[PDB]
């Protein structure tokens, strides 16, 4: 089997991407944030505290003939940005882009934090990291990909995120028309449950490439590119007037600037992030201070190749017995 679904930016900044997902019978279509940095499929639901729902589409398990309470199961998750959600669990039929999994754990939110309530465009998350991170207790549950894997033509999914444009998540096949040149594969460690890999270095603009190992995670659920402070300082030093602002919460730059590209290494290959991808616009409406798309990972504890980086590439998440990641230009 295979599946193919379009993913669409939620706003003009590509803050996140939503992908339609069919849950239950008859189908209830919810727009979910596919997140390669977590491993829970959770949804706004008829069980979500009413005051914490503001415009989201909800899953109502009582209207699905295939829903079944997973008795005694609960879940609770906290994300790196400080947001959180929790609730109970149903199993139901879930389809993504024509690919159907029966018996998928669908985690129904009883509570969500403010950040989720305030984002009307995201109806939940669909985790695509390794199932060892799944938070369901007392019986840990599998991700959609893990459940689908054995039925897939090839045990892979791909992320092809657009810059200010829709893109695609494919399951079970590599679309050889979707990228240019060749795909360079690189080793993954699953020890922390993430798609964790080591970049071979970086360049700023037209500058010379610096060979240096940068361990980090491929995370579609994180907006920005978070890298070591040394690397980030070298980048922003090439933008007149750029500075790290404690008040704003990171590097800002004059909105009048033209930003240089940023290149990262994947083995001997190079992925170039155009400067425009690094512009996240005015810090507040009407400001001439703009927020940077490359920020320090110091105090996160891990480097994160978020959307800023991933959308510059066609990315293969290879879930074979020995997992790997592939990157191609596009």
Short mmCIF file of C-alpha atoms in Angstrom, two decimals, residues 39-279:
data_model
loop_
_atom_site.label_atom_id
_atom_site.label_comp_id
_atom_site.label_asym_id
_atom_site.label_seq_id
_atom_site.Cartn_x
_atom_site.Cartn_y
_atom_site.Cartn_z
CA UNK A 39 5.05 9.96 18.80
CA UNK A 40 1.44 10.61 19.88
CA UNK A 41 -1.57 10.97 17.58
CA UNK A 42 -3.86 13.24 19.60
CA UNK A 43 -6.93 15.21 18.65
CA UNK A 44 -9.28 17.87 19.88
CA UNK A 45 -12.45 15.98 20.69
CA UNK A 46 -15.93 16.00 22.20
CA UNK A 47 -14.10 15.33 25.49
CA UNK A 48 -11.95 18.49 25.35
CA UNK A 49 -12.74 21.06 28.05
CA UNK A 50 -15.15 23.42 26.26
CA UNK A 51 -13.30 26.61 27.25
CA UNK A 52 -10.11 25.20 25.69
CA UNK A 53 -11.72 24.76 22.26
CA UNK A 54 -11.77 27.82 19.98
CA UNK A 55 -12.53 27.00 16.35
CA UNK A 56 -10.90 23.58 16.02
CA UNK A 57 -12.67 20.65 14.39
CA UNK A 58 -13.25 17.92 16.97
CA UNK A 59 -13.31 14.13 16.83
CA UNK A 60 -16.47 12.69 18.38
CA UNK A 61 -15.86 8.99 19.06
CA UNK A 62 -19.53 8.33 19.89
CA UNK A 63 -20.35 9.13 16.25
CA UNK A 64 -17.84 6.56 14.92
CA UNK A 65 -19.02 2.98 14.56
CA UNK A 66 -15.42 1.74 14.62
CA UNK A 67 -14.27 3.64 17.74
CA UNK A 68 -13.57 1.69 20.91
CA UNK A 69 -12.41 3.04 24.25
CA UNK A 70 -8.95 1.71 25.12
CA UNK A 71 -9.95 0.99 28.65
CA UNK A 72 -7.74 2.44 31.35
CA UNK A 73 -5.34 4.16 28.97
CA UNK A 74 -4.31 7.76 29.53
CA UNK A 75 -1.75 10.06 27.93
CA UNK A 76 0.00 13.30 28.80
CA UNK A 77 2.63 15.12 26.76
CA UNK A 78 4.76 18.22 27.04
CA UNK A 79 6.52 19.69 24.03
CA UNK A 80 9.78 21.61 23.77
CA UNK A 81 7.96 24.92 23.39
CA UNK A 82 6.27 24.40 26.75
CA UNK A 83 2.86 23.44 25.34
CA UNK A 84 1.02 20.36 26.56
CA UNK A 85 -2.11 18.22 26.33
CA UNK A 86 -3.55 15.11 27.97
CA UNK A 87 -6.56 12.82 27.95
CA UNK A 88 -7.76 9.26 27.31
CA UNK A 89 -7.54 6.91 24.32
CA UNK A 90 -9.73 5.29 21.69
CA UNK A 91 -8.75 2.92 18.91
CA UNK A 92 -10.27 3.69 15.52
CA UNK A 93 -9.62 3.56 11.79
CA UNK A 94 -7.30 6.30 10.56
CA UNK A 95 -6.51 7.09 6.95
CA UNK A 96 -3.91 9.45 5.54
CA UNK A 97 -3.86 10.13 1.80
CA UNK A 98 -5.61 6.85 0.98
CA UNK A 99 -3.51 4.75 3.40
CA UNK A 100 -5.65 3.11 6.07
CA UNK A 101 -4.67 1.76 9.50
CA UNK A 102 -7.23 -0.08 11.60
CA UNK A 103 -6.88 -0.14 15.37
CA UNK A 104 -4.83 3.07 15.55
CA UNK A 105 -4.60 4.67 18.99
CA UNK A 106 -6.35 8.02 18.73
CA UNK A 107 -5.58 10.02 21.86
CA UNK A 108 -8.53 12.19 22.79
CA UNK A 109 -7.65 15.45 24.55
CA UNK A 110 -9.43 16.29 27.77
CA UNK A 111 -7.09 19.26 28.30
CA UNK A 112 -4.83 21.33 26.05
CA UNK A 113 -2.61 24.29 26.87
CA UNK A 114 -3.28 27.84 25.72
CA UNK A 115 -1.01 27.64 22.67
CA UNK A 116 -3.20 24.89 21.21
CA UNK A 117 -6.51 26.59 22.03
CA UNK A 118 -5.28 29.80 20.40
CA UNK A 119 -4.39 28.04 17.16
CA UNK A 120 -7.73 27.35 15.48
CA UNK A 121 -6.10 25.82 12.43
CA UNK A 122 -4.53 22.79 14.17
CA UNK A 123 -6.96 20.03 15.22
CA UNK A 124 -4.25 17.82 16.74
CA UNK A 125 -0.87 16.22 16.14
CA UNK A 126 0.18 13.06 14.36
CA UNK A 127 3.51 11.88 15.70
CA UNK A 128 6.06 10.29 13.41
CA UNK A 129 9.07 9.83 15.71
CA UNK A 130 9.80 6.36 17.14
CA UNK A 131 7.08 4.63 19.14
CA UNK A 132 9.37 4.41 22.20
CA UNK A 133 8.42 8.06 22.86
CA UNK A 134 4.67 7.45 22.86
CA UNK A 135 3.14 8.64 26.16
CA UNK A 136 0.16 6.28 26.51
CA UNK A 137 0.09 4.51 29.88
CA UNK A 138 0.06 1.76 31.04
CA UNK A 139 0.33 0.23 27.56
CA UNK A 140 2.49 2.27 25.16
CA UNK A 141 0.99 2.63 21.69
CA UNK A 142 2.41 2.61 18.16
CA UNK A 143 2.53 5.54 15.75
CA UNK A 144 0.53 5.60 12.55
CA UNK A 145 3.73 4.87 10.56
CA UNK A 146 4.71 1.94 12.76
CA UNK A 147 1.25 0.45 12.39
CA UNK A 148 1.25 0.97 8.60
CA UNK A 149 4.81 -0.15 8.02
CA UNK A 150 4.33 -3.82 7.25
CA UNK A 151 1.63 -3.04 4.68
CA UNK A 152 3.65 -0.37 2.90
CA UNK A 153 5.35 -1.10 -0.41
CA UNK A 154 8.57 0.22 1.19
CA UNK A 155 8.96 1.05 4.89
CA UNK A 156 9.45 4.79 4.39
CA UNK A 157 7.69 8.10 4.47
CA UNK A 158 8.83 11.35 2.90
CA UNK A 159 8.43 15.01 3.80
CA UNK A 160 8.39 17.58 1.01
CA UNK A 161 7.45 20.84 2.75
CA UNK A 162 6.82 23.97 0.74
CA UNK A 163 8.13 27.49 1.24
CA UNK A 164 4.98 29.64 1.48
CA UNK A 165 3.27 26.87 -0.49
CA UNK A 166 1.69 23.44 -0.05
CA UNK A 167 3.80 20.32 -0.07
CA UNK A 168 3.40 16.58 0.35
CA UNK A 169 3.74 13.70 2.80
CA UNK A 170 4.07 10.33 1.09
CA UNK A 171 3.97 6.91 2.73
CA UNK A 172 5.41 3.75 1.27
CA UNK A 173 7.19 5.11 -1.81
CA UNK A 174 9.78 7.62 -2.98
CA UNK A 175 8.48 9.99 -5.68
CA UNK A 176 11.50 10.26 -7.96
CA UNK A 177 9.90 13.25 -9.72
CA UNK A 178 9.85 15.31 -6.51
CA UNK A 179 13.56 16.08 -6.18
CA UNK A 180 16.59 16.96 -8.24
CA UNK A 181 19.89 15.06 -8.39
CA UNK A 182 20.41 12.16 -5.99
CA UNK A 183 19.33 11.40 -2.42
CA UNK A 184 22.13 11.24 0.13
CA UNK A 185 21.41 8.93 3.02
CA UNK A 186 22.92 9.32 6.47
CA UNK A 187 22.86 7.25 9.67
CA UNK A 188 20.20 7.66 12.36
CA UNK A 189 20.39 7.04 16.07
CA UNK A 190 17.10 6.03 17.68
CA UNK A 191 18.58 6.09 21.19
CA UNK A 192 16.56 9.18 22.17
CA UNK A 193 13.52 8.15 20.10
CA UNK A 194 14.09 10.81 17.46
CA UNK A 195 15.21 10.87 13.85
CA UNK A 196 18.63 11.91 15.12
CA UNK A 197 21.53 12.28 12.69
CA UNK A 198 24.84 14.13 12.30
CA UNK A 199 25.28 16.94 9.79
CA UNK A 200 28.77 17.26 8.36
CA UNK A 201 29.01 21.06 8.61
CA UNK A 202 27.78 24.39 7.36
CA UNK A 203 28.41 27.49 5.28
CA UNK A 204 27.07 31.03 5.59
CA UNK A 205 26.10 32.68 2.33
CA UNK A 206 28.88 32.33 -0.24
CA UNK A 207 31.40 31.57 2.52
CA UNK A 208 33.65 28.56 2.83
CA UNK A 209 32.19 25.33 4.15
CA UNK A 210 33.13 24.48 7.74
CA UNK A 211 33.54 20.77 8.32
CA UNK A 212 32.16 20.02 11.76
CA UNK A 213 29.82 17.35 13.19
CA UNK A 214 26.46 18.70 14.28
CA UNK A 215 24.19 16.15 15.92
CA UNK A 216 20.52 17.02 15.71
CA UNK A 217 16.97 15.85 14.99
CA UNK A 218 14.85 16.11 11.86
CA UNK A 219 11.69 17.60 13.31
CA UNK A 220 8.77 18.64 11.11
CA UNK A 221 6.89 19.86 14.20
CA UNK A 222 9.44 22.59 15.01
CA UNK A 223 9.23 25.79 12.95
CA UNK A 224 12.82 27.01 13.11
CA UNK A 225 16.40 25.78 12.74
CA UNK A 226 18.12 25.51 16.16
CA UNK A 227 21.89 25.10 16.08
CA UNK A 228 24.93 25.60 18.37
CA UNK A 229 25.56 29.16 19.48
CA UNK A 230 28.86 29.26 17.60
CA UNK A 231 27.15 28.46 14.29
CA UNK A 232 24.26 30.83 14.88
CA UNK A 233 26.57 33.69 15.83
CA UNK A 234 28.59 33.13 12.65
CA UNK A 235 25.41 33.35 10.58
CA UNK A 236 23.97 36.51 12.15
CA UNK A 237 27.36 38.26 12.13
CA UNK A 238 26.83 38.50 8.35
CA UNK A 239 23.65 40.57 8.76
CA UNK A 240 24.17 44.25 9.55
CA UNK A 241 22.33 45.22 12.72
CA UNK A 242 21.38 41.68 13.74
CA UNK A 243 21.55 40.93 17.45
CA UNK A 244 20.31 38.51 20.07
CA UNK A 245 17.54 40.06 22.10
CA UNK A 246 16.74 38.58 25.51
CA UNK A 247 13.49 40.57 25.53
CA UNK A 248 12.24 39.13 22.24
CA UNK A 249 13.65 35.65 22.85
CA UNK A 250 16.32 35.28 20.16
CA UNK A 251 18.08 36.81 17.19
CA UNK A 252 16.37 39.70 15.46
CA UNK A 253 17.48 41.67 12.46
CA UNK A 254 16.48 44.83 10.60
CA UNK A 255 13.53 44.14 8.33
CA UNK A 256 15.41 46.13 5.64
CA UNK A 257 18.13 43.44 5.49
CA UNK A 258 18.79 40.96 2.72
CA UNK A 259 19.55 37.65 4.46
CA UNK A 260 22.34 35.30 3.29
CA UNK A 261 21.65 31.66 2.59
CA UNK A 262 22.66 28.92 5.01
CA UNK A 263 24.09 25.61 3.81
CA UNK A 264 24.18 22.38 5.86
CA UNK A 265 26.04 19.18 5.06
CA UNK A 266 24.57 15.72 4.63
CA UNK A 267 27.60 13.49 4.14
CA UNK A 268 29.41 14.95 1.12
CA UNK A 269 26.18 16.59 -0.09
CA UNK A 270 24.98 20.12 0.63
CA UNK A 271 21.48 21.52 1.22
CA UNK A 272 21.10 25.27 0.70
CA UNK A 273 18.49 27.19 2.65
CA UNK A 274 17.76 30.44 0.78
CA UNK A 275 17.95 33.59 2.88
CA UNK A 276 14.25 34.33 2.43
CA UNK A 277 13.42 31.09 4.27
CA UNK A 278 15.15 32.55 7.36
CA UNK A 279 12.86 35.61 7.53
#
